[PDB]
């Protein structure tokens, strides 16, 4: 599984990212990949809020959330998709752990 993790505080600010799995995956361009994926996650979905905002609102009320697939474009024109799941964790202050899973197919 090609993925990366984020941690957000309860304002939704990202306070860390873990790219260890991407760096072990043997492909170049993972920095561009992570930026592009995050930016796609945070983009307004037409008239609806971004998946980031939808997941944040849901996870803070109900403790878990999941996005459908969203697409983004690497610098060389390569089209990928990802989806995101997250979880409110009570350890310290409470934080939101998110996993972002890449589909290359």
């Amino acid at each position: 599984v090609e993925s990366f993790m984020t941690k957000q505080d309860t304002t939704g600010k990202i306070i860390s990212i873990d790219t260890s799995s991407l760096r072990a995956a043997g492909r170049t361009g993972w920095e561009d990949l992570v930026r592009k994926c995050i930016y796609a996650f945070f983009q307004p979905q037409g008239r609806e809020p971004s998946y980031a905002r939808q997941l944040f609102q849901e996870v803070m009320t109900r403790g878990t959330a999941s996005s459908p697939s969203y697409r983004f474009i690497l610098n060389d024109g390569t089209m990928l998709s990802a989806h995101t799941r997250c979880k409110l964790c009570y350890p310290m202050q409470p934080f939101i752990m998110g996993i972002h899973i890449i589909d290359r197919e």
Binding site: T11, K13, I14, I15, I17, V34, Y39, F42, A52
Partner: peptide, 14 residues
């Protein structure tokens, strides 16, 4: 509030 380019540069080096 989305993360800016500088927000991500910081997270990715830290």
């Amino acid at each position: 509030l989305p993360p800016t380019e500088q927000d991500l540069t910081k997270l990715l080096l830290e």
